[PDB]
Each structure stands twice: as structure tokens, then as C-alpha cells.
């Protein structure tokens, strides 16, 4: 028997949660491969009120670029005049007899098992409990 | 028997949750492969009121680019004059005899099993409980 | 027998939930492959009132670009003069004898099983409980 | 026998839920492949009142682009002069002898089984319960 | 026998739900493939009153573009002068001897089974219960 | 029996959580390979109020670049005139007889198992408990 | 029996958590390989209020670069005129008969097991407890 | 029995946590290989209020570079005119008959096991406890 | 029995944590190989308020470089005119019949085990405890 009685108080004006605006979860995972890279800000834990962050506060830019006006026989396969961009330029240009991405192989992800769990995600106010 | 009695109080004016605006969940997962990369801000945990963030607060840009006016025989397969863009430029251009993406292979995802679970996602206020 | 009696109070003016505006769920998943990348903001957990975020607060841009006026024999297969865009430019241009995407393979997703579960998604106020 | 009696109070003025505007669900899933990427904001959990977010607060843009006026023999297969766009430009242009997308393969999704479940999605107020 | 008696109160003025404006559901799923990507805002959980969001608060744009006036032999297969658009430009242009989309393959979705379930979606107020 | 009685107080004016704006989770993982690199800020833990960070506070740039005007026979496979960009330029250009990425191999991810767990993610206020 | 009674006080005006804006988690992991390198700031722990950091406070740059105007037979495979960029330039250019990345090998990730766990992630205020 | 009674005080005005803006976690790991190098600032522990750091406070740069105007037969495979960049230039250029990265070998990551754990991540205020 | 009673005080006005903005963790690891080198600042422990650090306070640079204008037969495989860069230039250029990186070997990471742990990460204020 976890407890005979609670007997918390002889008087009380309230018990419980007012204005609960919180967001709760159990975002745990069980996998074989994760790719979360290629970002401009990442995994930064900032505790405290009135936090602030800026990628670029101010940029007074004037800009000229020329990838053209080329009178030559062959200009090909080229990324050029890229600028003022906040983010990732990935696999931008490819020139090939054959291009492939992520071929999944022969019998390459077979018979893999997961047995992962949690008991509860609970936010509560109780006079006595277990 | 978890408890003989609750006997919490001799007087009370309320018990429970007022104005509950919270969002609860159990977003746990069981998988073999996850790809969540290629972002401009990611996995940043900011505790505290009045938090603020800006990707680019101000940019007074003037800009000229030329990828044309080319009198040459062949200009081909090229990303050019990209600019002022916040995000990801992926697989932008391809020139090939054959192009493929994600071929799924021969017997490449067979007989894989998952047995994953949770008990509850519960936000509550109770006088006594188990 | 979980409990003989509740006997919470001798007097009470209310018990329960007023103005419950919350959104509850069990968004758990069991799968083999997830692709959630290529975003401009992602997985950012901001606790606290009066939070604010801006992708670009202000941009006073003047802009000139030319991908034309080309008197040459062949200008082809090219992404050009892209600008002021917040988001993802993916697989923008392809030039090939053959183009394919996501071929699903031979016997490539066969006999895979899932056995995943949860017990409850419950927001409640009760005097005594189990 | 979970409980002999509830005996919660000798007096009460109410028990239950007033003004319940909440949205409840069990959005759990069991699958083999999920693709939720290519977004401009994603998976951002913002707890707290008076939250605000802007993709672009202000943009005073002046803009000139030219992809034409080309007197050359062949200008072809090209994305050009894209601008001021918030979202995703995917598979925008293709030039090929053959174009295919998502061929589903030979015996490529056969005999796969799911056995996934939940017990309840319940928001309630009860004096005593199990 | 779950309980001998409820005996909740000696006096009561109400029991039940007034003004219930909530929306309840069991949106759980069991499938093999889901594609929910290509959005401009996604999976953002905002708890708290007076939340606000804007895609673009203000844009004072002036704009000139020219994809024409081309005196050349052949201008073809091209997306051009796209602008001020919030959303997705997908598979915009195709030029080919043959174009296909989603061919469903030979015996490619055969004998797949689902056995998924829930017990209840219930919002209730009861004096005692099980 | 964890406790005979709680007997916390003879008088009380409240017990519980007011204005809970916190975000709780169990983001633990069990995997074989993780790639979270290629960022511009990462894993920075900043405790304390009024924290601030800037990627570039101010940049008054004037800029000229030329990758064109080339009268030579063949200019090819080149990234050029990249500038003023905050983020990652990955696999930007490829020129090959064949290009492949992430081939998944023969029997290369087979029979791998996970058995990982947690008991609870719980934020609560209780007079006595276990 | 962990305790006979709590008997904390004869009078009290409150017990619990007000304005909890904290973010809690159990981000522990069990894996075989992690790659978190290639960043511009990393693993910096700054305790104390009013912390500040700048990547580049001010840069008054004037800039000229030329990778063109080349009248020679073959200019190829080259990254050039890169500048004013805060982040990572990885695998920028490749010229080859064959290009591959991350081939996954033969039987190269087979029968690997994880058995990792935690008991709780709990932030709470209780009069007496275990 | 860990304690007969708490008997903390005869009077009290509060017990618990106000304004908790802290971020707690258990980020422990169990693996075989970690690569966290190639950064511009790393593992710097700065205790104390009003901390500040700058990568480059001020740079008044004027700059001219030329990698072109080359009339020679073959200029190839070269990184040139890189400048004013804060971050990592990795694997920038490759010229080869074959290029490979991270081949995963034959039976090279097989039967490896992890059995790692923690008991709790708990921030709390309690009158008496164990 | 760890203690008969706490009997801390006859009067008290508060007990607990106000304004807790701290960030706690258990970042312990168990592995076989770690590579955290190649940085511009590292492992610097600075105790005390008002700490400051600068990579380069001021640089008034004027700069001219030429890697071009080469009329010779073959100029190849060369990093040139690199400048004003704060960070790491790694594996910048490669010219070879074959290039490989990190081949994982034959049976080279097999049967390795970890059994590492911690008991708690706890920040708390309690009248008496164990």
C-alpha cells in the first residue's frame, strides 16, 4: 500500500495548474543513421530572458559580377556569381555520362529490428501520488 | 491497495486546470534512417521570455549581374547569378546521358520489424492518484 | 483494490477544467526512412512569452540581372538570375537522354512489419484515480 | 474492486468542463517511408503567449531582369529571372528523350504488414475513476 | 466489481459540460509511404494566446522583366520571369520524346495487409467511472 | 508502504504550477552513425539573461568579380565568384563519366537491433510523492 | 516505508513553480560514429548574464577579382575568387572518370546492438518525496 | 525508513522555484569514433557576467586578385584567390581517374554492443527527500 | 534510517531557487577515438566577469595577388593567393589516378563493447536530504 492517507491540509484555496502554456513531448528515437548537418546555426542552448541573435545585423552592399560575355567555344558546367545567400548550396551542378544518387544496394537494409519505449510524458499537480 | 483514503482537506475553493493552452504529444520514433539537415537555423533551444532572432535585420543592397551577352558557340549546364536567397539550392542543374535519383535496389528493404511503444501522454490535476 | 475511499474535502466550490484551449496528441511513428531536411528554420524550441522571430526584417534592394542578349549558337540547361527567394530551389533544371526519379527497384520493400502502440492521450481533472 | 466508494465532498457547486475549446487527437502512424522536407519554416515549438513570427517583415524592392532579346540560334532548357518567391521551385524544367518519375518497380511493395494501435483519446473530469 | 458506490456529494448545483466548442478525433494512420513536404510553413506547434504569424508583412515592389523580344531561331523549354509567388512551382516545364509520371510497375503493390485500431475518442464528465 | 501520511500543513493558500511556459522532452537516441557537422555556430551553451550573438554586425562591401569574357576554347567545371555567403557550399560542381552518392552496398545494414528506453518526462508539483 | 509523515509546516502561503520557462531533456545517445566538426564556433560554454559574441563586428571591404578573360585552350576544374564567406566550402569541385561518396561496403554494418536507458527527466517541487 | 518526519518549520511564506529559465539535459554518449575538429573557436569555458568575444572586430580591406587572363594551354585543378573567409575550406578541389570518400569496408562494423545509462536529470526544491 | 527529523527552523520566509538561468548536463563519453584538433582558439578556461577576447582587433589591409597570366603549357594542382582567412584550409587540392578517404578496412571495428554510466544531474534546494 503506497500510502494510508494524504491529510495534506485543514484549509486550502486552490490546487492545480493555471495558464499552462507549456509544450511537452517524448521525442526519443531508435535508428541506424541520422544526418542533421549543413546548417547556419545549430544545437545552441540559450537559457535566460531577453535572448537575441542576428545572422547579419546590417549589410550595405554594392555588387557587380559577370559570368557572361564569353566569346569562347565552350563554357560549361560551372556555378558562378553566387552571392549574398544565407543557407546551403549543395550538389549545385553535375555534368556526366550517368548521374545517380543514393542507390539502395542489394539486400542492404534487411531484418533490422527496433524494441524501444517510454512510460509517460506527464505534467501534473497532485496532493499525494505514485 | 495503493491508498486507504485521500483526506486532502477540510475546505477547498477549487481543484483543476484553468486556461490550459498547452500542446502535449509523444513524438517518439523507431526507424532506420533520418535526414533532417540542410537548414538555415536548427535545434536551437531558447528558454526565457522576450526571446528574439533575425536571419538578416537589414540589407541595403544594390546589385548587377550578367550571365548573358555570350557570343560563343556553347554555353551550357551552369547555375549563375544566384543572389539574395535565404534557403537551400540543391541539385540545381544536371546534364547527363542518364540521370537517376534514389534507385531502391534489389531486395534492399525486406523483413525489417519495429516493436516500439509508450504508456501515456497525460496532463492532469488529481487530489490523490497512481 | 486501488483505494477504499476518496474523502477529498468536506466543502468544495468547483472541480474540473475551465477554458481548456490546449491541443493534445500522440504523434509517435514507426517507419524505415524519414526525410525532413531542406528548410529555412527547423527544430527550434522557444519557451517563454512574447517570443519573436524574423527571416529578413528589412531589405531595401535595387536589382539588375541579364541572362539574355546572347547571340551565340547554343545557350542551354542553365538556372540563372535567381534572386530574393526564401525557400528551396531543388532539381531546378535537367538535360538528359533519360531522366528518372525514385525507381522503386525489384522486391525492394517486401515483408516489412510494424507492431507499435500507445495506451492513452488524456488531459483530465479527477478527485482520486488510477 | 478498484474502489469501495468516492465520498468526494459533503457540498459542491459544480463538477465538469466549461468552455472546452481544445482540439484532441491520436495522430500516431506506422509506415515504411515519410518525406516531409522542402519547407520555409518547420518543427518549431513555441511555448508562451503573444508569440509572433514574420517570413519577411518589409521588402522595398526595385527589380529589372532580362532573359530575352537573344538573337542566337538556340536558347533552351533554362529557368531564369526567378525572384521574390517564398516557397519551393522543384523539378522546374526537364529536357530529355524520355522523362519518368517514381517508377514503382517489379514486386517492390509486397506482403508488408502493420499491427499498430492506441487505447483512447479522452479529455474528461470525473470525481473518482479508473 | 469496479466500485460498490459513488457517494460523491450530499449537495450539488451542476455536473457536466457547458459550451463545449472542442473538436476531437483519432487521426491515426497505418500506411507504407507518405509525402507531406513542399510547403511554406509546416509542423509548427504554437502554445499560448494572441499568437500571430505573417508570411510577408509588407512588400513595396516595382518590377520589370523581359523573356521576349527574341529574334533568334529557337527559344524553347524555359520557365522565365517568375516572381512574387508564395507557394510551390513543381514540374513546371517538360520537353521530351516521351513524358511519364508514377508508372505503377509489375506486381508492385500486392498482398500488403493492415490490422490497426483504437478503442475510443471520448470527451466526458462523469461522477464515477471505468 | 512508501508513507503513512502527508500532513503537510494546517493552512495553505495554493499548491501547483502557475504560468508554466516550459518545453520538456526525452530526446535521447540509439543509432550507429550521426553526421551533425558543417555549421556556422554549434553546441554553444549560453547561461544568463540578455545574451546576444551576431554572425556579422556590419559589412559595408563594394564588390567586382569577373568569371567571364573568356575567349578560350574550353572553360569548364568551376565554381567561381562566390561571395558574401553565410552557410555551406557542398559538392557544388561535379564533372565525370559517372557520378554516384551514398551507394548502400551488398548486405551492408542487416540484423542490427536496438533495445533503448526511458521511464518518464514529468514536470509536477505534489505535496508528497514517490 | 520511506517516511512516516511529512509535517512540513503549521502555516504556508504557497508551494510549487511559478513562471517555469525552462527547457528540459535527456539528449543522451548510444552510437558507433559521430561527425560534428567543420564549424565556425563550437562547444563554447558561457556562464553569466549579458554575454555577447560577434563573428565579424565590422568589415569595410572594397574587392576586385578576375577568374576570366582567359584566352587559353583549357581552363578547368577550379574553385576561384571565393570571398567574404562565413561557413564551410566542402567538396566544392570534382573532375573524374568516376566520382563516389560513402559506398556502404559488403556486410559492413551487421548485427550491431544497443541497450541504453535513463529513468526520468523531472523538474518538480514537492513537500516530501522519494 | 529514510526519515520518520520532515517537521521543517512552524511558519513559511513559500517553497519552490520561481522564474526557472534553466536548460537541463543528460548529453552523455557511448560510441567508437567522434570527429569534432575543424572549427574557428572551440571548447572555451567562460565563467562570469558581461563576457564578450569577437572573431575580427574591424577589417578595412582593399583587395585585388587575378587567377585569369591565362593564355596557356592548360590551367587546371586549382583553388585560387580565396580570401576574407572565416570558416573551413575542406576537400575544395579533386582531379582523378576515380574519387571515393569513406568506403565502409568488408564486415567493418559488425556485432558492436552498447549498454550505457543514467538515473535522472532532475532540478527540484523539496522540504525533505531521498 | 538516514534521519529521525529535519526540524530546520521555527520561522522561515522562503526555501528554493529564484531566477535559475543555469544550464546543467552530464556530457561524459566512452569511445575509442576522438579528433577535436584544427581550431583557432581551444580549451581556454576564463574565470571572472567582463572577460574579452579578439581574434584580430583591427586590420587595415591593401592587397594584390596574381596566380594567372600564365602563358605556359601546364599549370596545375595548386592552391594559390589564399589570404585574410581565419579558420582551416584542409585537403584543399588533390590530383591523382585514384583518391580515397577513410577506407574502413576488413573486420576493422567488430565486437567492441561499452558499459558506462552516471547516477544523476541534479540542481536542487532541500531542507534535509540524502
Residue numbers in the entry:
A (entry chain E), B (entry chain F), C (entry chain G), D (entry chain H), E (entry chain I), F (entry chain D), ...: 1 to 130
From the paper:
Lysozyme is an important component of the innate immune system that helps to neutralize pathogenic microbes. Natively folded lysozyme possesses a compact, globular structure and has been the archetype example of a protein from the α + β class of protein folds. The protein contains two domains, an α-domain with mainly α-helical conformation and a β-domain containing mainly β-sheet structure. Systemic ALys amyloidosis is a debilitating protein misfolding disease that arises from the formation of amyloid fibrils from C-type lysozyme.
We here present a 2.8 Å cryo-electron microscopy structure of an amyloid fibril, which was isolated from the abdominal fat tissue of a patient who expressed the D87G variant of human lysozyme. The atomic model, which we derived from the 3D map, depicts a polar fibril with C1 helical symmetry. The fibril consists of a single stack of fibril proteins; this is, the fibril contains a single protofilament. All 130 amino acid residues of native lysozyme could be fitted to the 3D map and formed the fibril core. The fibril protein shows an all-β fold that lacks elements of α-helical conformation. The fibril encompasses fifteen cross β-sheets (β1-β15) with strands varying from two to nine amino acid residues. There are three internal cavities that are termed here A, B and C. The fibril protein fold is stabilized by four intramolecular disulfide bonds that occur at residues Cys6-Cys128, Cys30-Cys116, Cys65-Cys81 and Cys77-Cys95. The mutant residue (position 87) occurs within a tightly packed, hydrophobic β-arc of the fibril that is formed by residues Cys77-Cys95. The stark differences between the native protein and the fibril protein conformation demonstrate the need of unfolding of the native conformation for amyloid fibril formation.
